[PDB]
Structure 1
Amino acid sequence: SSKSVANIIRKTIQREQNRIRMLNQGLQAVSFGQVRGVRLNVNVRESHAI
């Protein structure tokens, strides 16, 4: 059960990362003052990765 929990967590993380990276594409090259692009950075906390 523990291993399954870990695996489902990992898979959900991957799916969400992929979807966010996909959505990120539409905001490429947006000119705002000196701003030229926007990104949603997604990461896994090491304290939680371990």
Structure 2
Amino acid sequence: SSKSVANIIRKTIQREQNRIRMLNQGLQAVSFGQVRGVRLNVNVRESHAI
């Protein structure tokens, strides 16, 4: 019930954010014309954060 569900959801979210952050680093400093880097921006929706 309650808190434990929130904790498993939070840990899953945290793990996904961290893995994305690791993938994200391999793409730093890639030169394509005037583009110099690429990222996958991950964010949490407010209506679900509250």
- Normalising by structure 2, report the TM-score: 0.91
Large movers: runs of 4+ above 2 Å: none
More strand by share: 2
Distance 1:45 1:33 in 2: 33
| Greater helix proportion | 1
Where structure 2 has 5 or more consecutive residues not aligned to the other structure, the ranges are none
Number of residue pairs the alignment of both structures matches: 50
- Alignment TM-score, normalising by the size of structure 1: 0.91
Percent identity over paired residues: 100
Cα RMSD, aligned residues only? 0.7
